[PDB]
């Protein structure tokens, strides 16, 4: 018959290939597929929903919930600093986040990102923080002035309550690596006081702010790979 | 379609338009996340953006390239015996099918509440020679749907498969592979469940009450050989033509046991991936 | 005709004698396009105030001279405006114009080979896997070699010329954009060069895209008083400079 | 080359498409 | 196209026309190479040429037939052990991908500054029998993209490849071969680089700062065997659908180490291919 | 199914074959390909650019640069000879040259070739050399007259500076071998004084000439093979 | 075409017409062979023929069915060694290509002065077991065109074939076969030659001066094995798409050595196929 | 994919098969094929050219040239006989002949054949021989009359010089075997004096006749096989 | 015979063409 | 079945034809 | 893909159809 | 499926037909 030549790759097996296989159970008509509210079609979707950020990434706090709140304090001094985290989306505190947890399934990431903060303060309470995105290039800023110099957003706490800070995409390589890499260093984001936290009489003087991160329509990932954030130093029983 | 599908440009992401400054009233950067909804703010909103025509596809970010990848879900083992061949419960394996006997993959699904798909099973038998010559070791992998004679031992009457499926692989001839329709009495495979067997304060509760899909029984047909062996037939699984409903938060605690959520480690404190910081002030 | 005139800033250069001019890879330097781009912010493009004709430190052409190089993204780490915008921004992109002046008389004999080189990964002078040091591939206006002496403790490059410093028989170097300065016809050398790099805008600090080399091929030979010094002067002009990824400010080193 | 479902059943086929 | 492509007559060279004598002013043979440009003089210019219709194609002189040829770039080796199976860092190989662990081929590229292409990897496992019978030695070649659990040892949890690629080859069945898309975050693969990790006077500088593409981990699935072996799985690589930018002078000094240019031999004077002549006068 | 016959060659592996292979990493959309000034498409291009020639292929000179210059001297005698090299493009001094280095990647070569020379002399200086191409057939000429008899070019040093000598293609076999072969002997090229090197007062009396070789549109190669000019008597470390 | 080509009736021979007697002047049977030409006389001329419609094709009498047949032209041999592996000039063969290392086939061509064709080479490796188990003996057949690093010994750097051809065959997988274009700088392959290397009264003269096509180097990749072997990889050759110019008288004296005509046997009188008769009178 | 069935013959190797093979050396454009005077396309051609016949197939003669001439003698008697050979084209003296040498490459032969004779006599000399073809059936004739009875040609030596004798094709089986076979016996051809060899004064009285055999358009062969006429009881050196 | 990209992805295909 | 030069190059093909 | 009774006889064919 | 004389010669073919 057809003079054929069997090619090199032939007979192999790849955990990543698109090929057909005789279906055992011929003539089987599967249960119909009823209608079910909420079906996904793209990881992306999940990536665009803001999940909460562990940031109070500190000691005893960590195994608890607090590990999620950031109390905005006193501050005797002025123009003092709140916190910082680095943008490299696979870096505790980030990592664990619905996003992070994910990204860690792919080798490369890209686009803008969104950080949102909420005031679990009081009503009569007031404040004004300055948040900033310090692109890759230098060291996480020691001072506000130094950080205010780049990308930022002044946040006026008020009747609203949620300020969303965007993290533009600044990079040389259209794409960044999800894995820790000195090169693909995305930078830092930090928060400082613009004014203070003023509270009229008989209101607490510390209060919390929750923070979150969802994606931007910018966003996109690639090169699927097995995760980081989960070592099954098992096995698993029965 | 082709180009778009060959070039893999099916799901493309929008581009980043150009912006100008805004000394205006409506503040898009301000929303109240308590509404439970998600913000809608973009680069163009917050900054003075430029103009970048994108070219990234969200193709590989599809429940089919996220799910559609083969994964070890079971490692059937047979330390043959020649002393007693047959005997009860020997030289033949029986496994009850499930995607959670192996973290890795179990993990991955669990990302969703409900799932559905046609499954492709690939068998990778590996014959370890513990003898000076392995001969010709034929093999039979029979699929036993629920409520069926499961071989008591090696040559029952059930290995006749007069109406069952048995795939045969003989040393040399390639890896056996076969597809299977979505098997569930339900419209979808229950990745989870908050139900029980009954009111019996001793009833079962989990992803088990629901999915009991039968078993796979392995046999090494060939009869008695001289020089021993041990067979290790690996079971890989791929999800083709998949759908998923209601996403869930991933798992961060190493499980134990299947068909259960239970984490509570044997003594050891419950460990998670989160790392500790000295101070929030420096990252 | 050989005469040439060039105007770049608030600056202009003339040359009553020349060997054409050369455009690197036959492409003229220009600004980045929203197609090949990647970043999202609006680049700052100092025009004129930045992409102008900066002249470096001059050098002596010896009968003992061996050769000297300057690395471009770096040679102007001090040249006002451009060289500030460099330090204030993460992403920097720019093309250049190289005016190499070296006169003497028609009674002199000498030959200089001038060349620019995309990604000029130099080799260390010492065997091993130790790569040249930062601080030494980042000389500045001043350039490197001359035929100089230095600590061998430093993860120091190859002062070695004939191997191209990269270990490629110099002479095949003619593959890189170049020209000579044959003191009998020539006066200068003019290289113009676009932005070459697998990325739309790189780090003006970590990465030097263009590397320039000038190498005495036929040794300078007069019969005059060695009171007669024949310098070599390099002048450069960022062209279509574009920056972005604004913020604090790096630090000098 | 494509759409040649060499096998009868539908459960047997390549990874679906995208739309 | 066919004929031209089958006959390989795509890129043909011009012919040599006929000339006559020239007792004329403009002297094409005179140009000033200092302009850095290249002369344009031809046979027809310098002599009294004839007329030759050519028929030589510059097909084989294409970056694709210059590059598109398979070359050993790595030789994975596994001197099995049966004494301790598993153990840490054993019986499983892990290699970090690169085209410069082998002169030959490294050489060839390096002829250009930047390069880009889809790569086809071919695996040639060769099983040396150090025993009286090799059995059935199955194999697993897993590709670990950057930032991923790299097997600590032989059976991690990473050999489940729930979302990774693992190709399997069993003695008999032919050589495994698979293609891979251009993997770089950059528009092209950096054949060279004049950058560093950072300002740290201890930062990295080279073609490494940039290309860290992951690793390939080899395993011999089969379990414990009786009679020993040693496996040598050769890794060949071919460049298909290639492009190249800014040519460079070839290499004449035998390198040492990769991701570096360094030549400086251990003691021996730096040697090059140039030969010595007694006199220029006679060749 | 299709009654097929598996042909002899089947299952083999060739480092030189055009065949497809399942692509691992399905659904991957590679980084776009931005625009980059200067891309090659044919070795040829590189072959047409004149690279410098080591010719002062002599002793101590060789590991240095000089190894590239040819000083035009005194010459008490007249009609004396300068140098010679042989044309067989894979023969030191030629070989190492961008061309040579290359050609050594193919088994066969063909067409014309171009030799260019430049005067790194002075301005007030003057000279006239005679360059010649002595086709294959006899011995590299001992004398000028004998060599002038074949292909040549008188070179008048002047305001110009570069004389380019063409090496026509003379051969029996449309094609020549790149490898040393008595048959495929391309011949010799040599240079002699036509007049002298005259210099008015207080100008040096020796000066150099650089020489080069680029290809002709004639040119073409074939039968790729692994190079000569590079033995990796390594290995290569880490 | 088909029918004519399937039925093999392409080149058919004329038929033998009918004749009558001739009592006439012109005598076709008389010609003068001194003219060096060949007579043109036929059956019909000489006798009173009948009428036979023929049906014999001269298809099989075509330089392509005369030449286009595979023939042993070389028998590469490797008496492995495990004692010293590598070492200089060992366990790896190197042969310089030629059709005259084997009478048979050499014979056949030699029937013509010049020849040209594309060649198909088929490799028949045969592994003789001198041990109690041969394992998995992989193989590499590399083609080294003239002027190339020929492996000094077994693992040079030349077995990387970064730009050379190496075919790989592993025990089981079928015979390797590959075609090759007409390789000559000349329009045709010189079956003979009346030229020399030069005027050197010590120059070479023959079919060698001219055809030096490179070499084929064999290696047995697998590494060190336990139980020895000897490999004998036979090299067959077929001429496809052949042309021939100026036929010659066949050879009747058993040659000796190749690239030469020399017959002069070692002592023995020169022997030829002609047989001796007692008398011409009786056959 | 395509449910295929591998047929019995599969994987074999035949020294006689038409199949394609990946061509190593992709993209190679072979030397053009210049024009060359005299190219063959069919063995036949070679078979139609008369080559000389060894017939003086006798003792000491044989290793020499004479082995080719047949001297026409005295003959005291009259009506005497010259020589004979048998037609079975693979039978010394025939065999060795360009034809024979060939035919011995095929298993079967057919058609008519041509024998030509030439008089290397004198000019003033004269003769008349009778040549005859005695078809298969009986014994090579002892006498002329007996032989004249079948197929023949009287030859008048004269100003011409060459007489060509045709050997019609007489056989039962459309085809004959090239190999010695009692069945496929083609017969005998013999030559005798019709008159004499008369020579006027002072002319030699013995003279030679050369003989040849070329094919007829009748002719055709088949079933290629390896030759008879050449045993390489070698090998062959270097 | 040609252009039968038996495989989906483009990265998998023969050596490109020439133009 | 024929003229299906499964391979690119011409050197690789069946025994030529006759004419 | 179907109805390609690669074999002559009818007894050799796939599982019949349904109607 | 038929009449696909994959081989050139006629001697090589299936069992003839019937008529
Ligand atoms: O039996 C497998 C195990 O996993 C679940 C998810 O909890 O889902 C399924 O996926 C399988 C793939 O191997 C099917 O074989 C299966 O039988 C199906 O339910 C479970 O319900 C099941 O217990
Ligand atoms: O990792 C290989 C090594 O070579 C470079 C060139 O310096 O380029 C590449 O080519 C590879 C082919 O095997 C790709 O696998 C690779 O990962 C890619 O970079 C390097 O950057 C790399 O270090
Ligand atoms: O190298 C083989 C030997 O035979 C000749 C005829 O004398 O012709 C050739 O045929 C070969 C087939 O194997 C080609 O490989 C070959 O290289 C070619 O010349 C000779 O010239 C040659 O010496």
PDB file of C-alpha atoms in Angstrom, chain A residues 11-25 28 30-34 36-44 46-50 54-60 62-63 67-68 81-86 92-93 96 98 101 105-106 110 112 114 118 140 151 153 155-156 160-164 166 168 175 188 212 214 216-224 226-227 229-232 235-238, chain B residues 11 13-17 27 29-34 37-44 46-47 56-63 65-66 68-71 100-104 106-108 111-112 114 116 120 122 124 165 174-175 177-188 236 238 240 243-258 272-283:
ATOM      1  CA  UNK A  11       5.436   6.349  18.986  1.00  0.00           C
ATOM      2  CA  UNK A  12       6.351   8.913  21.612  1.00  0.00           C
ATOM      3  CA  UNK A  13       3.969  10.323  24.239  1.00  0.00           C
ATOM      4  CA  UNK A  14       3.608  13.976  25.202  1.00  0.00           C
ATOM      5  CA  UNK A  15       1.636  15.249  28.120  1.00  0.00           C
ATOM      6  CA  UNK A  16       0.895  18.133  25.746  1.00  0.00           C
ATOM      7  CA  UNK A  17      -0.501  16.821  22.503  1.00  0.00           C
ATOM      8  CA  UNK A  18      -3.636  17.070  20.517  1.00  0.00           C
ATOM      9  CA  UNK A  19      -4.554  13.626  19.134  1.00  0.00           C
ATOM     10  CA  UNK A  20      -7.663  11.448  18.929  1.00  0.00           C
ATOM     11  CA  UNK A  21      -8.134   8.017  20.619  1.00  0.00           C
ATOM     12  CA  UNK A  22     -10.619   5.202  20.063  1.00  0.00           C
ATOM     13  CA  UNK A  23     -13.421   5.892  22.526  1.00  0.00           C
ATOM     14  CA  UNK A  24     -14.122   2.772  24.702  1.00  0.00           C
ATOM     15  CA  UNK A  25     -17.902   2.814  25.491  1.00  0.00           C
ATOM     16  CA  UNK A  28     -22.761   6.352  24.777  1.00  0.00           C
ATOM     17  CA  UNK A  30     -23.930  11.426  27.920  1.00  0.00           C
ATOM     18  CA  UNK A  31     -26.260  13.053  30.373  1.00  0.00           C
ATOM     19  CA  UNK A  32     -27.586  16.210  28.834  1.00  0.00           C
ATOM     20  CA  UNK A  33     -25.905  19.367  29.964  1.00  0.00           C
ATOM     21  CA  UNK A  34     -28.366  21.459  31.911  1.00  0.00           C
ATOM     22  CA  UNK A  36     -25.799  26.338  35.277  1.00  0.00           C
ATOM     23  CA  UNK A  37     -25.381  29.928  36.405  1.00  0.00           C
ATOM     24  CA  UNK A  38     -21.810  30.991  36.185  1.00  0.00           C
ATOM     25  CA  UNK A  39     -19.405  29.120  33.945  1.00  0.00           C
ATOM     26  CA  UNK A  40     -15.852  30.362  33.196  1.00  0.00           C
ATOM     27  CA  UNK A  41     -14.088  30.245  29.872  1.00  0.00           C
ATOM     28  CA  UNK A  42     -10.886  32.080  30.700  1.00  0.00           C
ATOM     29  CA  UNK A  43      -8.577  32.281  33.619  1.00  0.00           C
ATOM     30  CA  UNK A  44      -8.494  35.943  32.857  1.00  0.00           C
ATOM     31  CA  UNK A  46     -10.694  35.190  37.719  1.00  0.00           C
ATOM     32  CA  UNK A  47      -7.703  37.403  37.359  1.00  0.00           C
ATOM     33  CA  UNK A  48      -9.840  40.472  37.025  1.00  0.00           C
ATOM     34  CA  UNK A  49     -11.597  39.968  40.342  1.00  0.00           C
ATOM     35  CA  UNK A  50      -9.875  41.579  43.250  1.00  0.00           C
ATOM     36  CA  UNK A  54      -1.889  39.566  53.045  1.00  0.00           C
ATOM     37  CA  UNK A  55       0.498  42.498  53.673  1.00  0.00           C
ATOM     38  CA  UNK A  56       0.692  42.590  57.376  1.00  0.00           C
ATOM     39  CA  UNK A  57       3.080  39.819  56.343  1.00  0.00           C
ATOM     40  CA  UNK A  58       4.421  40.001  59.882  1.00  0.00           C
ATOM     41  CA  UNK A  59       5.404  37.381  62.401  1.00  0.00           C
ATOM     42  CA  UNK A  60       2.587  36.221  64.704  1.00  0.00           C
ATOM     43  CA  UNK A  62       0.613  35.855  59.587  1.00  0.00           C
ATOM     44  CA  UNK A  63      -1.193  32.676  60.627  1.00  0.00           C
ATOM     45  CA  UNK A  67      -2.474  39.377  58.186  1.00  0.00           C
ATOM     46  CA  UNK A  68      -4.897  41.286  55.848  1.00  0.00           C
ATOM     47  CA  UNK A  81       5.634  56.096  55.684  1.00  0.00           C
ATOM     48  CA  UNK A  82       3.020  53.279  55.912  1.00  0.00           C
ATOM     49  CA  UNK A  83       4.085  50.154  54.021  1.00  0.00           C
ATOM     50  CA  UNK A  84       5.591  48.771  50.900  1.00  0.00           C
ATOM     51  CA  UNK A  85       5.489  45.525  48.906  1.00  0.00           C
ATOM     52  CA  UNK A  86       7.131  44.750  45.593  1.00  0.00           C
ATOM     53  CA  UNK A  92       4.679  36.965  49.136  1.00  0.00           C
ATOM     54  CA  UNK A  93       2.713  38.961  50.160  1.00  0.00           C
ATOM     55  CA  UNK A  96      -1.067  33.558  47.522  1.00  0.00           C
ATOM     56  CA  UNK A  98      -6.074  34.629  43.397  1.00  0.00           C
ATOM     57  CA  UNK A 101      -1.617  31.756  42.999  1.00  0.00           C
ATOM     58  CA  UNK A 105       1.039  28.392  36.701  1.00  0.00           C
ATOM     59  CA  UNK A 106       2.659  30.250  33.836  1.00  0.00           C
ATOM     60  CA  UNK A 110       2.370  41.136  31.334  1.00  0.00           C
ATOM     61  CA  UNK A 112      -0.912  46.723  33.917  1.00  0.00           C
ATOM     62  CA  UNK A 114      -4.613  47.310  39.809  1.00  0.00           C
ATOM     63  CA  UNK A 118     -10.493  50.583  51.342  1.00  0.00           C
ATOM     64  CA  UNK A 140      12.451  51.028  47.204  1.00  0.00           C
ATOM     65  CA  UNK A 151       4.042  57.296  39.501  1.00  0.00           C
ATOM     66  CA  UNK A 153      -1.906  58.757  43.438  1.00  0.00           C
ATOM     67  CA  UNK A 155      -5.924  59.396  48.070  1.00  0.00           C
ATOM     68  CA  UNK A 156      -8.565  61.516  49.784  1.00  0.00           C
ATOM     69  CA  UNK A 160     -16.141  57.271  48.931  1.00  0.00           C
ATOM     70  CA  UNK A 161     -13.792  54.896  50.622  1.00  0.00           C
ATOM     71  CA  UNK A 162     -11.997  53.083  47.893  1.00  0.00           C
ATOM     72  CA  UNK A 163      -9.104  54.440  45.914  1.00  0.00           C
ATOM     73  CA  UNK A 164      -7.728  52.289  43.153  1.00  0.00           C
ATOM     74  CA  UNK A 166      -3.026  51.633  38.683  1.00  0.00           C
ATOM     75  CA  UNK A 168       1.185  50.989  34.423  1.00  0.00           C
ATOM     76  CA  UNK A 175       7.121  40.433  28.575  1.00  0.00           C
ATOM     77  CA  UNK A 188       7.845  48.605  44.276  1.00  0.00           C
ATOM     78  CA  UNK A 212      -6.589  44.424  47.049  1.00  0.00           C
ATOM     79  CA  UNK A 214      -7.284  42.598  40.491  1.00  0.00           C
ATOM     80  CA  UNK A 216      -6.256  45.264  34.077  1.00  0.00           C
ATOM     81  CA  UNK A 217      -7.530  44.491  30.519  1.00  0.00           C
ATOM     82  CA  UNK A 218      -3.917  44.935  29.693  1.00  0.00           C
ATOM     83  CA  UNK A 219      -3.007  41.731  31.401  1.00  0.00           C
ATOM     84  CA  UNK A 220      -2.116  38.418  29.940  1.00  0.00           C
ATOM     85  CA  UNK A 221      -0.036  35.367  30.726  1.00  0.00           C
ATOM     86  CA  UNK A 222       1.657  32.485  28.943  1.00  0.00           C
ATOM     87  CA  UNK A 223       3.838  29.406  28.834  1.00  0.00           C
ATOM     88  CA  UNK A 224       1.927  27.181  31.237  1.00  0.00           C
ATOM     89  CA  UNK A 226       3.343  23.670  37.183  1.00  0.00           C
ATOM     90  CA  UNK A 227       3.062  25.875  40.340  1.00  0.00           C
ATOM     91  CA  UNK A 229       3.134  27.892  45.793  1.00  0.00           C
ATOM     92  CA  UNK A 230       2.279  24.234  46.537  1.00  0.00           C
ATOM     93  CA  UNK A 231       4.550  21.296  47.419  1.00  0.00           C
ATOM     94  CA  UNK A 232       2.703  18.092  48.064  1.00  0.00           C
ATOM     95  CA  UNK A 235       1.406  11.678  49.805  1.00  0.00           C
ATOM     96  CA  UNK A 236      -2.238  11.757  50.210  1.00  0.00           C
ATOM     97  CA  UNK A 237      -4.152   8.986  51.902  1.00  0.00           C
ATOM     98  CA  UNK A 238      -7.536   7.355  51.997  1.00  0.00           C
TER      99      UNK A 238
ATOM    100  CA  UNK B  11      -8.678  35.893  22.180  1.00  0.00           C
ATOM    101  CA  UNK B  13      -6.498  41.827  24.546  1.00  0.00           C
ATOM    102  CA  UNK B  14      -7.332  45.468  23.821  1.00  0.00           C
ATOM    103  CA  UNK B  15      -4.716  48.095  23.384  1.00  0.00           C
ATOM    104  CA  UNK B  16      -3.798  50.980  25.576  1.00  0.00           C
ATOM    105  CA  UNK B  17      -4.984  54.153  24.025  1.00  0.00           C
ATOM    106  CA  UNK B  27     -13.143  60.525  39.680  1.00  0.00           C
ATOM    107  CA  UNK B  29     -10.337  56.138  40.687  1.00  0.00           C
ATOM    108  CA  UNK B  30     -12.844  56.275  43.507  1.00  0.00           C
ATOM    109  CA  UNK B  31     -15.316  53.354  43.808  1.00  0.00           C
ATOM    110  CA  UNK B  32     -16.673  51.437  46.889  1.00  0.00           C
ATOM    111  CA  UNK B  33     -15.468  47.858  46.718  1.00  0.00           C
ATOM    112  CA  UNK B  34     -17.959  47.000  49.425  1.00  0.00           C
ATOM    113  CA  UNK B  37     -18.138  44.398  42.568  1.00  0.00           C
ATOM    114  CA  UNK B  38     -14.858  44.916  40.885  1.00  0.00           C
ATOM    115  CA  UNK B  39     -13.380  48.182  39.911  1.00  0.00           C
ATOM    116  CA  UNK B  40     -13.093  49.077  36.309  1.00  0.00           C
ATOM    117  CA  UNK B  41     -10.142  51.494  36.187  1.00  0.00           C
ATOM    118  CA  UNK B  42      -7.426  51.447  33.608  1.00  0.00           C
ATOM    119  CA  UNK B  43      -4.085  52.775  32.708  1.00  0.00           C
ATOM    120  CA  UNK B  44      -5.604  55.388  30.488  1.00  0.00           C
ATOM    121  CA  UNK B  46      -4.959  57.049  36.086  1.00  0.00           C
ATOM    122  CA  UNK B  47      -2.100  58.245  33.947  1.00  0.00           C
ATOM    123  CA  UNK B  56      -1.139  39.034  23.321  1.00  0.00           C
ATOM    124  CA  UNK B  57      -3.639  36.351  23.137  1.00  0.00           C
ATOM    125  CA  UNK B  58      -5.514  34.920  26.043  1.00  0.00           C
ATOM    126  CA  UNK B  59      -5.569  31.673  24.139  1.00  0.00           C
ATOM    127  CA  UNK B  60      -3.346  29.754  26.575  1.00  0.00           C
ATOM    128  CA  UNK B  61      -5.580  31.275  29.374  1.00  0.00           C
ATOM    129  CA  UNK B  62      -8.537  29.056  28.502  1.00  0.00           C
ATOM    130  CA  UNK B  63     -10.022  26.454  30.631  1.00  0.00           C
ATOM    131  CA  UNK B  65      -5.100  24.821  27.877  1.00  0.00           C
ATOM    132  CA  UNK B  66      -5.312  25.267  31.644  1.00  0.00           C
ATOM    133  CA  UNK B  68      -6.128  19.961  28.801  1.00  0.00           C
ATOM    134  CA  UNK B  69      -2.727  18.527  29.925  1.00  0.00           C
ATOM    135  CA  UNK B  70      -1.949  14.871  30.903  1.00  0.00           C
ATOM    136  CA  UNK B  71      -1.163  14.167  34.595  1.00  0.00           C
ATOM    137  CA  UNK B 100      -7.548  13.304  43.670  1.00  0.00           C
ATOM    138  CA  UNK B 101      -5.112  10.503  44.536  1.00  0.00           C
ATOM    139  CA  UNK B 102      -2.476  12.932  43.265  1.00  0.00           C
ATOM    140  CA  UNK B 103      -2.064  16.553  44.385  1.00  0.00           C
ATOM    141  CA  UNK B 104      -0.681  18.392  41.351  1.00  0.00           C
ATOM    142  CA  UNK B 106      -6.287  17.580  41.895  1.00  0.00           C
ATOM    143  CA  UNK B 107      -5.151  21.047  42.839  1.00  0.00           C
ATOM    144  CA  UNK B 108      -5.805  22.553  39.435  1.00  0.00           C
ATOM    145  CA  UNK B 111     -10.060  25.817  41.300  1.00  0.00           C
ATOM    146  CA  UNK B 112     -13.717  25.352  40.249  1.00  0.00           C
ATOM    147  CA  UNK B 114     -18.238  22.065  38.942  1.00  0.00           C
ATOM    148  CA  UNK B 116     -17.374  18.500  32.908  1.00  0.00           C
ATOM    149  CA  UNK B 120      -8.358  10.668  27.544  1.00  0.00           C
ATOM    150  CA  UNK B 122      -2.937   7.075  28.606  1.00  0.00           C
ATOM    151  CA  UNK B 124       2.525   3.960  30.516  1.00  0.00           C
ATOM    152  CA  UNK B 165     -13.556  -2.936  28.119  1.00  0.00           C
ATOM    153  CA  UNK B 174       3.326   1.512  22.072  1.00  0.00           C
ATOM    154  CA  UNK B 175       1.540   3.082  24.891  1.00  0.00           C
ATOM    155  CA  UNK B 177      -4.431   5.331  24.929  1.00  0.00           C
ATOM    156  CA  UNK B 178      -8.214   5.572  24.781  1.00  0.00           C
ATOM    157  CA  UNK B 179     -10.863   8.263  25.243  1.00  0.00           C
ATOM    158  CA  UNK B 180     -13.967   8.091  27.390  1.00  0.00           C
ATOM    159  CA  UNK B 181     -17.237  10.003  27.273  1.00  0.00           C
ATOM    160  CA  UNK B 182     -18.327  12.122  30.228  1.00  0.00           C
ATOM    161  CA  UNK B 183     -19.500   9.531  32.609  1.00  0.00           C
ATOM    162  CA  UNK B 184     -21.888  11.047  35.180  1.00  0.00           C
ATOM    163  CA  UNK B 185     -25.619  10.602  35.908  1.00  0.00           C
ATOM    164  CA  UNK B 186     -25.470  14.355  36.638  1.00  0.00           C
ATOM    165  CA  UNK B 187     -24.981  17.142  34.062  1.00  0.00           C
ATOM    166  CA  UNK B 188     -21.490  17.797  35.433  1.00  0.00           C
ATOM    167  CA  UNK B 236      -2.032   9.796  32.983  1.00  0.00           C
ATOM    168  CA  UNK B 238      -6.214  14.654  30.077  1.00  0.00           C
ATOM    169  CA  UNK B 240     -10.526  17.455  26.408  1.00  0.00           C
ATOM    170  CA  UNK B 243     -16.337  23.332  30.814  1.00  0.00           C
ATOM    171  CA  UNK B 244     -16.160  24.941  34.224  1.00  0.00           C
ATOM    172  CA  UNK B 245     -18.568  26.695  36.571  1.00  0.00           C
ATOM    173  CA  UNK B 246     -18.084  28.848  39.675  1.00  0.00           C
ATOM    174  CA  UNK B 247     -14.369  29.387  40.409  1.00  0.00           C
ATOM    175  CA  UNK B 248     -12.911  28.973  43.807  1.00  0.00           C
ATOM    176  CA  UNK B 249      -9.937  30.144  45.780  1.00  0.00           C
ATOM    177  CA  UNK B 250      -6.942  27.782  45.173  1.00  0.00           C
ATOM    178  CA  UNK B 251      -5.678  25.416  47.856  1.00  0.00           C
ATOM    179  CA  UNK B 252      -2.787  26.540  50.097  1.00  0.00           C
ATOM    180  CA  UNK B 253      -2.628  23.705  52.576  1.00  0.00           C
ATOM    181  CA  UNK B 254      -1.157  20.384  51.540  1.00  0.00           C
ATOM    182  CA  UNK B 255      -4.069  17.947  51.686  1.00  0.00           C
ATOM    183  CA  UNK B 256      -4.137  14.363  52.985  1.00  0.00           C
ATOM    184  CA  UNK B 257      -6.651  11.781  51.812  1.00  0.00           C
ATOM    185  CA  UNK B 258      -9.056  12.382  49.017  1.00  0.00           C
ATOM    186  CA  UNK B 272       0.893  27.475  54.151  1.00  0.00           C
ATOM    187  CA  UNK B 273       2.963  29.149  51.474  1.00  0.00           C
ATOM    188  CA  UNK B 274       2.907  32.602  53.032  1.00  0.00           C
ATOM    189  CA  UNK B 275       6.324  33.968  53.964  1.00  0.00           C
ATOM    190  CA  UNK B 276       7.138  36.194  56.975  1.00  0.00           C
ATOM    191  CA  UNK B 277       8.393  39.716  56.865  1.00  0.00           C
ATOM    192  CA  UNK B 278      10.437  41.589  59.444  1.00  0.00           C
ATOM    193  CA  UNK B 279       8.602  44.775  58.629  1.00  0.00           C
ATOM    194  CA  UNK B 280       5.931  46.043  56.386  1.00  0.00           C
ATOM    195  CA  UNK B 281       8.080  49.093  55.751  1.00  0.00           C
ATOM    196  CA  UNK B 282      10.660  47.364  53.543  1.00  0.00           C
ATOM    197  CA  UNK B 283       9.990  44.688  50.997  1.00  0.00           C
TER     198      UNK B 283
END
